[PDB]
Design a protein around this nucleic acid. Sequence first.
RNA 1: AAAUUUAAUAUAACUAUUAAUAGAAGGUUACUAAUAAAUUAAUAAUUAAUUUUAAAACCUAAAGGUAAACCUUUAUAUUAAUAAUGUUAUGAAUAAUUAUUAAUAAUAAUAAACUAAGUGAACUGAAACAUCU
RNA 2: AUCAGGAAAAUUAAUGUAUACCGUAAUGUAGACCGACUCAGGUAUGUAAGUAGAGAAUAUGAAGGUGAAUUAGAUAAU
Lengths: 134, 169, 146, 45, 126, 104, 49
Amino acid sequence: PTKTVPVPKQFWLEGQTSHMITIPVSILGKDLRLVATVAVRDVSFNGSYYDAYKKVMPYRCVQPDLIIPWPKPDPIDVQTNLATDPVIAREQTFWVDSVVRNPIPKKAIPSIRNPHSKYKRGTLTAKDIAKLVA
Amino acid sequence: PTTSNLRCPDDHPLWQFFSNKKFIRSADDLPPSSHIRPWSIPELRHKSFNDLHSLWYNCLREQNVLARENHLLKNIVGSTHDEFSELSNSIRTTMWQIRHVLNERELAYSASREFLQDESERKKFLDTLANDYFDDEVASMLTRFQLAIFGDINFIDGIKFLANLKLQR
Amino acid sequence: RQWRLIETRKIAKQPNYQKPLHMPKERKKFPDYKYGESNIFKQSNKGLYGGSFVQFGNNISESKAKTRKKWLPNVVKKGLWSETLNRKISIKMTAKVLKTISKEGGIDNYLTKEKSARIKELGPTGWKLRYRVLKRKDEIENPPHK
Amino acid sequence: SRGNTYQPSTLKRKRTFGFLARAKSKQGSKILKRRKLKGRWFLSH
Amino acid sequence: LTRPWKKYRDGELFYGLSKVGNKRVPLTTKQGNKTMYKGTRASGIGRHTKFGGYVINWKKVRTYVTPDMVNFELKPYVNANVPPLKHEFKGGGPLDPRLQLLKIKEYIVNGRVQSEGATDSCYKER
Amino acid sequence: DINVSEKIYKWTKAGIEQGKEHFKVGGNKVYFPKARIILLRPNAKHTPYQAKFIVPKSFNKLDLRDYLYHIYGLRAMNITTQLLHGKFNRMNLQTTRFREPQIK
Amino acid sequence: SGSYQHLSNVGSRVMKRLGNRPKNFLPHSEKFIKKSTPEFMKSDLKEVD
RNA sequence: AAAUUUAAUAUAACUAUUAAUAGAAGGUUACUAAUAAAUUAAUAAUUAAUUUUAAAACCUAAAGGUAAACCUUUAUAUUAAUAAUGUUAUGAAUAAUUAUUAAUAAUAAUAAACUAAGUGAACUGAAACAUCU
RNA sequence: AUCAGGAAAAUUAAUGUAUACCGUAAUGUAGACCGACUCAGGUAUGUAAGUAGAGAAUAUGAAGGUGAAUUAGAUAAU
Ligand SMILES: [Mg+2]
Ligand SMILES: [Mg+2]
Ligand SMILES: [Mg+2]
Ligand SMILES: [Mg+2]
Ligand SMILES: [Mg+2]
Ligand SMILES: [Mg+2]
Ligand SMILES: [Mg+2]
């Protein structure tokens, strides 16, 4: 479905002579089916491998033997300053090591976790109990 | 007054609030969400404290640059595109993950300490370790590591243990 | 008689402890009174009233003209000797209570009488007094070393 | 000439009708509770 | 006129859209007497003086501690080509002491050996 | 000896010479600050030697100075705070009044 | 715009009220929205929460 | 062989009855106040059940105040013990800062109806009214 | 003079100081407050050019401010 609607010069593409342009309207998945000259209809979704899509992708079953694969995820060349490179991201710079010196300074604890937290409660000692009961 | 009278420094620390020397990051010059992914908690889990700190600071810096830009977009042009906002949100998520991991590590350490304090189990653990370790150079290395880990009362105890080990071998 | 305004009082059942959001700073010196403190004729909590309270009834004329009136017990402030405490204890005292005390032979005796009725018709102050006396007695009987 | 009976002064108004004033006294507490039960959005100045 | 596009007398206000409104609303710094001081969680820093001044106490003044060894290679985002990692913890919780002990033992045996040095990994860790 | 202002100035100078802090670092360390600052464009009244930021409502002047030095290696010599009024805004007119942010 | 709304979250309750409009009066708001958008921006499909 | 209608069902109404089961956060504005597992069953991802676990700003009579969402205390606390450090007076003594270990307190937001108890009107009815109601 | 006139928180010496938070627009004898209205009402304090004069009376007005959500004509009776 592609409706023809008059669009401003702001949103013009390099070529559009008239203000009139044809553009695609969205469609509900319920109103369109899978092809493979075929029409799938019902899909099962039971098994589930991981593509390395880099995610655990389920199997599309039509009749559970016939599997239709997911399409090929488009390649993507990362060349941004704000994205760290893979190897660096993945590297290991912390092993548990000690049981005497903590991993983080005493002074940095307030930053990562709230003292004066009103949900602490704690206690419930024997001495305390003794103190309360008459 | 004229600006020719000035000599605006090129490496002035206030340029650090912009991407490169640029008023707005263009739609083309932003990192698209297809490429960018926020840091995972598990992945972070094995990262040093210093490195984590550095990462956090970097994130903050990035947010600042986004933040300014976002403000400009909102207040002046009055745009609703919110790419910058999304980016900021992503950064925030990462930051929170980092924070969580930091907390978690501390908690783990505390737990370990508690376990150690329970003297019945700790002794058993030590014994098991000894058994496991019982090459000579390799043993020495392992023993050295153990000593380091151990490292006034505690120190004394460690020393005693070392002595005992030596006696045994 | 009936102890309706005593044995009807109810206090928040304590949860026993094998912590609470707000624990008190001090230590409960005295044992909890079963029936608690009276929220009805609070004048009574200061002393020994014998479970007597203010009644409210009708003044009635020769024309049967009703008009609300109250009835007070005959309270008297009275310093009375306690052998166990070794001092005179002054308190508010319904004259009935005084009479009872006289009959029974001493304030300690009155306090330390076992029956549930007696317990009911002590106040919180009365209860405290009883605790003091019995504890003292125990101490007298039983030094730390036999 | 009547009509101008309300002579605003922020101090007086917060001190008399303010949330803190209400919450401090038993009667005030009652009022606040009443307003909560009605579901009023604004419990007092 | 106040505004020349409205010539005729309409139901328009000198400023704004309505004189009235909810007056029972949290008050800010700007409103109140001279004596009304609101404050904005900014200064529990020092101590006021007997005379009106303010003596700062630095044992309580927030400073921000940037790490001296800045790893600039760590960036706010990560490459999409890296899949998200999924730790496993069958030996109850990541903050389980037993697991930590095991890890320590492993470290002692080995000494700084990387588990996810291979960038090509769905789940791992024990 | 000499008076207080002079002393302060001297201290500042010394700090500058050193290439460290030109102000007494508070013995109160925060490691992971969530705060952010917006760099604003300069008004007609501001010089090129002045820059201004929108900062947290709960931000201290001292804190801002510290923050700039540590995160951005920027030496802020003098700092001036300006808290802005929140004006009442209302959308529908059937909807309640409320104030816009007090911004610092 | 010229607001500073983005820097704050104020009128939180009000926002919630206007954000979480009961679903049976969703037709109303949506109609208005439809009315106040150009032909190229608007779409015939109903939003999901 | 797909569509159309009819009747029933939602996370998405309230009201009355009957039957079953059980007895529970609001606000304010921002340096926004996030989660992490395990085990068992179903079939590596899975959903469910059973669990442990992180965070969680400020206010909502009683840390102590106030003009609710602020201020003031100062658990990035004090004391002790030690360790590196600079100064002074005579290897020993005194004070200052940082760092580890130990000791020492922390936060009344909590319903409503129902129940029991204390006090307890009057209008009204009596074709007036006071006994009575 | 008679009317008889507030309350409450010390010195020296040695050692010190990096100076927090908030108010700050404009309006304020008013179109920006209280009066249902851009309402001849109500609303606290200081300075209030000279000339003149007993004065903050009264006249003028240097400077500053203002000439307005009704105009234009006509001006019967009233
Ligand atoms: Mg009125
Ligand atoms: Mg009064
Ligand atoms: Mg008005
Ligand atoms: Mg004002
Ligand atoms: Mg005050
Ligand atoms: Mg009753
Ligand atoms: Mg007027």
